[PDB]
Design an enzyme around this catalytic site. Structure first.
Site, PDB file in Angstrom:
ATOM      1  CE  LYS D 139      -3.718  -2.537   2.116  1.00 38.16           C
ATOM      2  NZ  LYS D 139      -3.916  -3.369   3.350  1.00 38.16           N
ATOM      3  CB  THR D 140       3.970   1.909  -1.628  1.00 37.23           C
ATOM      4  OG1 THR D 140       3.847   0.987  -2.713  1.00 37.23           O
ATOM      5  CG2 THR D 140       4.569   1.156  -0.436  1.00 37.23           C
TER       6      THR D 140
END
Lengths: 288, 285, 285, 286, 288, 289
Positions: D139-140
């Site tokens: 989740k970047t």
């Protein structure tokens, strides 16, 4: 000042552009390298055309990528009086000759544009005009950075650079939006506080509508000089803070006719679309 | 035939080129899109200059990337007689206007070069010459594919395309190698069987040295016409396999003077370095 | 209007961006494809956070590159009330699952920024302010297009986009140039007619110098509200054509204090630097 | 490991390309402001205005190196930041410093903000007496993963799952597509072979047991309440001692200790990358 | 001369290629860097296979991008007699180990090809043939520059490099054009003065048609040696200016059979399609 | 797994970019030969002239799709080839077919050559009664790894170590740099954490024991003679039954059975990618208009 203009060009941007140019000219093996060998060499850069020298940072970046060094004998923006020794290029002979054509092509076109810009600036100054001669987005695809830089060295404004700069409302936008007022209202909303709005106008009626709708610049396009100046006069009287640009069919020869006290900017497609390249050669004169 | 030349252009190469041009002209947000909206629209392409129409495949590729369609009313390579309606472009308004400038810039320059080439070809033909008018590598960096294609549409040979095409021995190579014989020897070794060798010669002496050394093409550079033809005459006589090229200071006006029975190729830097762009406009209607 | 904002984004620019994101997340073999297989599938997009929906064009572009189709049940810019069914995505299973994380990451951040922008816009409106809430160049490197688009969907001005848009004279420029007057003179020469000049001022004295030298915008940076409004008042009195921007230490909570009749723009780094991503999920059904 | 040694993870060619794309984003054409500052040799001080952990030196250095500027650091990578702190000096032509300024500060601010969040989570886990690993996720921010994962590492968290080529992750969606946990894990195990681990996202004890039976290396117990999580991990560990247990879903800095236990090996937190505020840095020419 | 061949390779082209190879091998974090650390180190390059050393410029460019330096103990094109210490590489340990695999992979294949080429050149020379052994476009996609360079180091002609070089009229073009004469006429128009035309011929009749229509090279494809030489003889008798190439099913073992006084070029797909990589290793032996 | 399902491993955007770079390599400028064939709608047959295994259909298809041509396959991916076989047809404008021809055949030839070598090795291992996995390595042609690893998979081998981000490989070079096996493996284990495996290249039982003790997941027994290999793996598996054993170094198709044993889990072979001759394919235009 022409010598300080190179600071405008980020080194990484130049390197990528230069690399693409070298790839275009030599996509594979450089067979000719075997003819010259790698002996340390020197080459003289000769100017064979009159005009203005422009393009040193691109010329340098090409040769730097090829591990060659350039010593300039004339500053950027110098008047060229042929036949003039402009610079020496030093490096392994095959590298010098690999860079030769791309470097000359770049300098020739940059200088040709700077020369045209300088001639226009001079004609405007001779006419007693204090406005700005400007270029346009009518540039060679992929080559805009060099062409706009050339305009600057010649003393013209680069002006509208791309579609992310000021919001230009042309005739076409007016047609699509359904009228000048609607188009300018939309443009003003898109430009907000960060960007200017310019509107291309074919009559005085259109120019007043544009100004009343908040245009920062009104571009009076393809007017005859006898219609241009009375229109700009009326416009400046009513909207003193609106800048006026003239464009369309302007040449070096007729430029003084478009100069007047109520014209702020004169843009010329010809400065980039019809400026002949200058004649330069690179002559290897010593090796080893 | 001009209409068949588009086959020379790989679609993936065009797409990448076209994408780079669109990125140059709009690196971030296209603010002006909000002014026109996305309504289906049509625009007429107008030719305002005389000359030769060239660059349809690039103009098409630009608009195809922007989901617009082009209908041409004149074939590629046709004569332009202003003011001529030459095409219609259809698509969402903002897409038409996003492509407009890049597409016009491309067509204008391609056509400007085709027009210069066609004028040169016509002058050579009027002189009774059966050789080939050619371009050179004096092209705008990054834009060579368009400029060479334009020459072809105008009826000129694209000729030397890049440094991998034939082994060109110039003045500089001669100096570096230490003489014409040594340079040509090395060039021939490098060229082997797959590539031709051309030598740029500034003098009668060099021209003969190059021929004698086995060059495929001898380029007689910056000769006066009165010196050019006698020099070429002896090359054709003693080296009948050698092709003779003339270049250097050749203009549309003096081209017929460089035409002669022993000249095979005339290359002109001016066709790409000094061909004014044609005037085109695109008008939404 | 939020639904019309997608027109700002060129399709070729999106495609390149999207391709780089997919390359980052799967540089080689997609091993997990063998787990799901290629059977035609559907997935529901669920909004699990309140806020504003933004980033549909990017979400769409990602799935288009993967040969999947998206049906949206809410327009761009819609209020999100959790848990909300927002869209359906259809395509081969492995393509849906290859796009899932990148698409969710993008929508989450775009929407998180739009939500923060909308909250700020609302707070400003609640304070009776008619100026523009704006973002800044304090964006995640490489992701600026999405972040600025998010601001716009939230009703904030994207404002200064990059170093080519208006000439910004900061504290650092003043130091380098040797004074505000010198800096602004140089900036005005560089901006010419096409670009505005903005000057970051730390004090009333710098602001007046900037306006006197002909800046288009004066940015009053890190003023206390009690100092800000008197400063802006005098500026507008003496320089009626100069626009005033306030910035520095502005939060959603204190925003109304920075709102006043002589402030035109309020820019907030927090809208891009400290906006939490929204919670979205994509569930095969 | 040690924060100062983490820069070795970053290939110089990868950094150079990343940095070049960032500079191109911020200045696609002419750099007009260069004419304002000129090219005189200059110096600027880097100031830390936020508490937290310093992270991102290699990226900051790469940006300025591309612009022919030099950086002297007064604090090592991973340092605690106690504002207002003098972190560094940058030297170069004035216009080059100012061209790199915003991109460099944006990068350092975010990298440090993530390292700060990671360090706070690692500290909370350690204060709870937990010896497991705090980890990040995929989740970047798209295109920025290298910086965000590096920031997690500097903060003492595991980068963990980096991309879709790293360990075969069987999520809920894969289970649905494959037609069951057993089928999905069997396929994942075939694809992973000997070189890659298989992790399975599990919503119940029965799913975790099926996953472990079918050869999963890691079982991810997702969105469990702590009171359900620990008994599940206990039973799983009793029957499958070699299987690693990861906990994720709704974990925050505040509730992290509740997810800590002797049978949890990894705790992964989306918030470390999705909700870490950037630190406040400035660069001031002097 | 093998040592001079590196001049054929532009440094910007190499850098881009090398960068793509490093990206392929390490698209994200280089975890193993933490194992070795950054201490200054040395590694020895060992040749474990007989053959010809080729690919130094690529090997060097890889390590240069990683801030490592290479010292060569044998020139490019040297005979390799295993087991031989052939270079030392110096740099930060993690940089050396990051470049190791890509560098060894590149050298191994370039040298494998150079070795195959040298064996073929030697067999042709032993047969008393003075023509040129040549490669083809049967190269690994994206890797052509390395493979063609390896051919050259081995003493073979790189020969046809890409589709922008000589105009090759194959079987397929003849079918599409509707006959040899039509195909060659078209190719001659396309090639003009700058490019040669080569025509792939399967019979003597086709060869004569090709030569008559102005082919520069006639490629006699998949002839038996007993048919090849009489065909080439008759062809040279009638068309002295035309070069003759032989190809199709030629191996190192049968190469002498294809050698003859009327054959100018012998091209072999096997030199690039079936040359085993040489065995090299890089042994980091010191750190600090 | 099943060869026909392997194409799902390949993202379409990754293929498109790779394919585009290959086409650019083979035709950087004008395609002069296009003027010889023209653009008339044409058909060509793909012929297999070598025995082995067919592999590389997704790349072959992607090349032609970029050129607006279509491919009909008459054999599934992974099929045995028994020459001479007509295995596909390609349809499209003549100049597009001929522009794609060489790149497509070069790609298919090498992918299939590797698949063939892999299948031969897998068959030899199966004939020896071995249930382990034959694997490739990172000894691939630079820039071409995706094709070569895909080829290994179609042939039934494990792609195995793909790049430097996949499992942390501690070679003899790393042992020297770290100052010993225990120090190297400890560092590797810290870097790998929970997400990645650690493999250690060992030249002795004593190194293998140290590696396993320090937490290696895989021990690679490198360049052992078979007579030393199996007793070493036996003793090591006894002590560390969770550790997987890989054999490599000097393994050929001919000697592969000697390296097969009950305590060897993986056998990796550089030769599958470094020394697999390309298969002979041709594309013959048979129809136009």
């Amino acid at each position: 000042d022409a010598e300080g203009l190179a600071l405008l060009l980020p080194p990484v941007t130049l390197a990528a552009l230069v690399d693409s140019w070298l790839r275009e000219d030599c996509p594979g093996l450089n067979y000719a390298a075997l003819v010259s060998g790698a002996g340390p060499s020197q080459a003289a850069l000769w100017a064979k055309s009159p005009g203005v020298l422009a393009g040193q940072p691109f010329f340098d970046a090409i040769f730097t990528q090829l591990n060659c060094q350039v010593s300039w004998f004339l500053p950027e923006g110098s008047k060229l009086v042929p036949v003039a020794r402009v610079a020496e290029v030093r490096g392994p002979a095959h590298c010098l000759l690999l860079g030769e054509r791309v470097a000359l092509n770049t300098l020739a076109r940059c200088s040709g544009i700077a020369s045209a810009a300088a001639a226009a600036v001079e004609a405007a100054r001779g006419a007693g005009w204090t406005g700005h001669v400007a270029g346009t987005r009518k540039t060679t695809p992929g080559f805009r950075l060099v062409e706009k830089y050339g305009l600057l060295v010649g003393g013209a404004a680069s002006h509208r650079y791309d579609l992310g700069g000021l919001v230009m409302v042309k005739d076409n936008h007016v047609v699509a939006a359904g009228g000048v007022e609607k188009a300018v209202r939309a443009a003003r909303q898109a430009a907000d506080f960060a960007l200017k709005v310019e509107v291309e106008c074919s009559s005085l009626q259109e120019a007043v509508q544009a100004a009343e709708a908040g245009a920062d610049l009104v571009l009076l396009d393809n007017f005859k000089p006898e219609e241009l100046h009375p229109t700009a006069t009326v416009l400046k009287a009513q909207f003193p803070s609106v800048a006026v640009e003239a464009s369309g069919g302007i040449t070096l020869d007729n430029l003084p006719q478009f100069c007047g006290p109520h014209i702020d900017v004169i843009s010329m497609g010809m400065l980039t679309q019809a400026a002949p390249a200058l004649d330069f050669s690179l002559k290897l004169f010593a090796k080893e």
